[PDB]
Structure formats: C-alpha cells, structure tokens
C-alpha cells in the first residue's frame, strides 16, 4: 500500500498520506481528523486486511495523525502511487505540487499561500496551513501533497470540487515528521 491509497477506520474512509519509519518501526501518516477517535485501520471496505493502530493524533489546531503498522505481510512502499519519495521539504509560494487521494486520484496545481487559518467550525480551527488551487473531494483526506520526489503536505480540507475547480489546504508534513520523530523513506 502506498501514498494516496484508501484507508478505512471504524467510521469512514481516508487516504494514506506517506509511509514513514523510525528505526525498524513502520508507520503511516494521515490527517489528524481521520485519526481522531479511530483505533484500528484496515486496507479494505470489508475490513478484513488490518493495517495497524492509531499511535497519535493531532486535530484541531494541527491536522496530522500516525498509525503504527501491525500487518506484517503488506508491502509498505515509500512512494505515492508509483512515484518515489526521497525526502521532505518546505512548501513555498509558487511551488508546483501534486496531490493523490483515494477518491479523486492524482491532481496538480500550485502553492498559492502559506500559514493559512482554516475554520472548519464548532471550534475546529487549524492554523499554519498550506493553501493551494488543487481540488479534493470526500475520501481524499490525509493523502499526500508532493512535488517531484519531495514530500510536502497532508490533505486536510477545503472547498470546491474537481469538476468545477477548488481550493485545498494541507498540513505541512515536516511538522509531523518532527513531532513523531519519523522520517520518509
């Protein structure tokens, strides 16, 4: 399973952000709004292929979560679909980026602003987000935003749709790697 693939929790479906590790321990990153209140994660709708269990979750304020792999057989590719990812980088205004998600597949665009505040309501506000003109739709949450072989962000939310065009905000991935002490591979 790789960046962009579907992930299922008890509650619904999100997308795998990036495969990361610490030592010999494998985890995956996804959005914190997906990890919040999720314990177990599976690879299919039927919930028969277990992936692992939530180890950390940060939302609102930030929007990242981490799940530790408990499935031993499943290949854990350090890619996004078949795109290799070799490092993490900071987003910059004007940077060309690509998003992949379980519902919409792959879509491109550019970083239009940094440090945006997005208010999802009910006190669910997130800060420090990357704004882009890339679309996203339900199910795409938590998938990767990358640029070339650089990991950049995790999909959080936004408006619009892929047909009409829209705006998507992403959580800087560097902040999660550093919080959990993990790195991409």
């Amino acid at each position: 399973i790789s960046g962009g693939d579907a992930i299922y929790s008890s509650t619904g479906r999100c997308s795998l952000g990036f495969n990361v590790r610490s030592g010999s321990t494998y985890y995956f990153l996804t959005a914190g709004h997906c990890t919040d209140g999720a314990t177990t994660w599976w690879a299919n709708s039927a919930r028969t292929t277990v992936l692992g269990t939530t180890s950390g979750s940060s939302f609102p304020n930030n929007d990242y979560g981490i799940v530790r792999y408990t499935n031993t057989t499943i290949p854990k590719d350090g890619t996004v679909g078949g795109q290799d990812i070799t490092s993490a980088a900071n987003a910059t205004v004007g940077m060309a980026v690509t998003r992949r998600g379980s519902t919409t597949g792959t879509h491109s665009g550019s970083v239009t602003a940094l440090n945006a505040t997005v208010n999802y309501g009910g006190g669910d506000v997130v800060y420090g987000m990357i704004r882009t003109n890339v679309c996203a739709e339900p199910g795409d949450s938590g998938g990767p935003l990358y640029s070339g072989t650089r990991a950049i962000g995790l999909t959080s939310g936004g408006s619009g749709n892929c047909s009409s065009g829209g705006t998507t905000f992403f959580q800087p991935v560097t902040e999660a790697l550093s919080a959990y002490g993990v790195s991409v591979y």
Partner: protein, 51 residues
C-alpha cells in the same frame, strides 16, 4: 443531520456518505450541508449511506 451552522467556507474531506433528495451521494455532512445552503434550502436528506 442539522445544517444550521452552514455555510462553512471549508470542509474536511473524510468519506462518510449521505444520500441527497437529488439522488446524489454527498461525501460527508459538511459537503451535504453546504449543498443544502446553496440550494436555498430545497435539497434534503433521503437516507444515510450512498444513494
């Protein structure tokens, strides 16, 4: 589902589908409620789950 606090400029994008009175599957409550608003209150909930 209550769409009173809508509209909302943004929605998180997890998938937990709902079925609208227009036969469209809405991906989550936030997306569904913003559509309600856009329709000026004419769209309603048919049932939970995909259509």
């Amino acid at each position: 589902v209550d769409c009173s606090e809508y509209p909302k400029p943004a929605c998180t994008q997890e998938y937990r589908p709902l079925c609208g009175s227009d036969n469209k599957t809405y991906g989550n409550k936030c997306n569904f409620c913003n559509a309600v608003v856009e329709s000026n209150g004419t769209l309603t909930l048919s049932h939970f789950g995909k259509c």
